[PDB]
Design an enzyme around this catalytic site. Structure first.
Site, PDB file in Angstrom:
ATOM      1  N   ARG A  25      -8.556   4.882  -2.840  1.00 28.24           N
ATOM      2  CA  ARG A  25      -7.838   4.061  -1.879  1.00 28.24           C
ATOM      3  C   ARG A  25      -7.516   4.873  -0.623  1.00 28.24           C
ATOM      4  NH1 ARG A  25      -7.940   1.525  -7.078  1.00 28.24           N
ATOM      5  NH2 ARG A  25      -5.841   2.305  -7.624  1.00 28.24           N
ATOM      6  N   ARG A  29      -3.112   1.396   3.423  1.00 22.30           N
ATOM      7  CA  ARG A  29      -1.987   1.292   4.343  1.00 22.30           C
ATOM      8  C   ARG A  29      -1.323   2.587   4.804  1.00 22.30           C
ATOM      9  NH1 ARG A  29       0.808  -1.636   0.283  1.00 22.30           N
ATOM     10  NH2 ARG A  29       2.436  -2.618   1.584  1.00 22.30           N
ATOM     11  N   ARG A  38      -6.493  -4.323   9.486  1.00 25.10           N
ATOM     12  CA  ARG A  38      -6.218  -5.346   8.475  1.00 25.10           C
ATOM     13  C   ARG A  38      -5.610  -6.579   9.127  1.00 25.10           C
ATOM     14  NH1 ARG A  38      -3.594  -3.987   2.599  1.00 25.10           N
ATOM     15  NH2 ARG A  38      -3.320  -6.118   1.806  1.00 25.10           N
ATOM     16  N   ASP A  75     -13.133  -5.241  -2.926  1.00 21.86           N
ATOM     17  CA  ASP A  75     -12.187  -5.514  -3.996  1.00 21.86           C
ATOM     18  C   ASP A  75     -12.899  -5.656  -5.333  1.00 21.86           C
ATOM     19  OD1 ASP A  75      -9.240  -6.376  -4.630  1.00 21.86           O
ATOM     20  OD2 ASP A  75     -10.510  -7.854  -5.651  1.00 21.86           O
ATOM     21  N   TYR A 152      -8.097 -10.389 -15.403  1.00 21.45           N
ATOM     22  CA  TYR A 152      -7.634 -11.240 -14.319  1.00 21.45           C
ATOM     23  C   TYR A 152      -8.196 -12.649 -14.467  1.00 21.45           C
ATOM     24  CZ  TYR A 152      -6.502  -6.752 -12.092  1.00 21.45           C
ATOM     25  OH  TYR A 152      -6.017  -5.491 -11.840  1.00 21.45           O
TER      26      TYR A 152
END
Lengths: 352, 352
Positions: A25, A29, A38, A75, A152
């Site tokens: 990652r 952010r 973003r 993703d 998920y």
């Protein structure tokens, strides 16, 4: 033409001058410029579908820290999203599904997406990024493992107890398998497309495998990741393309994984590097192990964790330094830079 | 006067006729009658403060399944709640704190609650339950470990990454220690009061210890639980009172824990029973290991997991069967009963 070999060599347990580094990652952010791009995309969902911007964020880390490898920004829920299930990314709650795979019908009706077709946008980024990296470093393609994805798809998002998949697993195993198998075929096609579109390496995230028994972990998770490997093309563009498997928490299952076919195994601060290498070292290369929160510490302290982790492993050749989990937004930019420099400067002694 | 010995004997690795059983969170929503009494209390918070009702729910399980032990109904956040921090139980979100311990001041100002005084209500239930159990079975007193408690006190509730305690741990260790130490003193007083008020056994939940390094797990978690044990009274009411430590996930740290002083170690489906016993068996008794989701399976299937788990251990004497985590509301009542009977019927062969 590629210039940096490190990453690719280390995963193959081949001599290197210094140990390689890259952070999970790294396109996140914690980078002010990331938070910006973003906002240009609108929502995360579209950010992952926009090739130009997807690349840009993948490139932002390389312009701050000379990392030995880059991972396309995408993703894990790419594949499940292309299976007609209703997936949205609530910047508050989390990844959610309106039509979670419930029973057998749900599975039999589930479709295998054509990577170049319905998932052809993650393939676009790959093509873009490769041409953008202008040979500076190898590009990593990624995807979740059959099981954590089915999580998920059954839970409908992130469950804290995975209360549903298991009710399925322990009461309707044929169904969970029907599902997991399809997911295996899928991601295999999915990953090859990346490899073909420029990916020089690849990695599977089975982030939830460790929530399982050792019996069930092997039945419903390892077998399927294994299949992917038996079906991934280990070579392309004149180069052997590496494969890294990663089950956060499953440090004890470490032995079975090595039998997978895979070239490298990932780790987290829960497993001792030395221990792991002493148990699989001469069989598979290892990837990172540090705790992301450690990046909050003062530079000096971080450096000594690189040095600590570099020892316990040290002496050999098959190691790629890394964190045990992605970076958290609050980590300061120059703090990672400290980390990225500590692995290079201080690991060079273990290759002489 | 106590009649059932099993639990107490097994924890002490002393011969028993059959293996003992009890389920974590046996006083839970899976019991229709539980959901009712909880509505009489109003909110969970008050349910835990009402002695009559707290007992009643602790007794409901024993009237359905002949379990070899009962655990007072209370909350782990009992102690942190009595430290003036603003704790509420949102039946939606979760346990939250309005004034999370942030820095050193927060810690130095933190007070040690008098169990009989400010936490004198959990002591009341103990007294009540003991007199209610009318000798039928031993009463277990419980509390969270210094660390997992400091988690909620710093995070302010349940964190998915524990991003804050660690920023503290890796950047302000003296502070985290100031805190953890106070928490050690506290819970030690807290647990003794239970022991004095009727508790015949006791157990510490370090539910989050496994999110740590093996280094940090020992520095900031084991040491402190250990202290409690060095300071708990192993005897009362003519009986040796047992102590069980339990770090969900920390199956690998299994070796250090045994050096704790503690009599029993808990486990979860992530660690192999046989393995665990082969590594500490002749040193400490072991508690349960099954996966709670397995209770969704058909009776026949569950029974064979009791039998599976009973093997891998079997042959010896020091074992208390149990789940690796509390029961989930959706589990059917007669399904647990099946489980509770499988451990008795099928474990009797391992004691002959």
């Amino acid at each position: 033409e590629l210039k940096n070999d490190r990453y690719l060599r280390a995963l193959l347990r081949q001599p290197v001058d210094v140990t390689p580094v890259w952070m999970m990652r790294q396109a996140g952010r914690y980078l002010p410029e990331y938070k910006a791009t973003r906002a240009q995309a609108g929502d995360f969902m579209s950010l992952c579908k926009n090739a130009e911007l997807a690349c840009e964020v993948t490139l932002q880390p390389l312009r701050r820290y000379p990392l030995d490898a880059a991972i396309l920004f995408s993703d894990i829920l790419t594949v499940p999203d292309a299976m007609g299930l209703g997936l949205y990314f609530e910047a508050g709650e989390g990844p959610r599904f309106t039509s979670p795979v419930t029973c057998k019908a749900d599975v039999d009706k589930l479709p295998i997406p054509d990577p170049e077709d319905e998932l052809g946008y993650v393939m676009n980024a790959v093509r873009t990024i490769r041409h953008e990296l202008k040979g500076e470093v190898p590009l990593i393609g990624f995807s979740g493992s059959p099981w954590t994805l089915a999580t998920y798809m059954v839970e409908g998002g992130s469950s804290k107890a995975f209360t549903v998949i298991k009710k399925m697993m322990y009461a309707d195993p044929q169904a969970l398998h029907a599902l997991l198998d399809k997911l295996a075929k899928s991601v295999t096609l999915y990953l090859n497309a990346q490899i073909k579109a420029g990916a020089q390496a690849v990695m599977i995230f089975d982030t939830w495998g460790g929530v399982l028994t050792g019996r069930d972990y092997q039945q419903f998770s390892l077998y399927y990741m294994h299949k992917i490997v038996d079906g991934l093309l280990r070579e392309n563009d004149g180069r052997r393309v590496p494969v890294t498997l990663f089950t956060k928490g499953g440090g004890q299952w470490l032995e079975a994984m090595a039998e997978t076919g895979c070239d490298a195994l990932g780790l987290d601060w829960t497993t001792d590097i030395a221990d792991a290498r002493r148990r699989v070292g001469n069989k598979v290369a290892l990837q990172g192990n540090m705790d992301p929160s450690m990046l909050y510490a003062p530079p000096a302290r971080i450096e000594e964790e690189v040095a600590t982790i570099l020892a316990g492993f040290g002496h050999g050749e098959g190691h790629v330094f890394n964190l045990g989990h992605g970076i958290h937004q609050d980590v300061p930019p120059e703090h990672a830079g400290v980390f990225v420099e500590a692995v290079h400067r201080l690991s060079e002694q273990y290759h002489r």
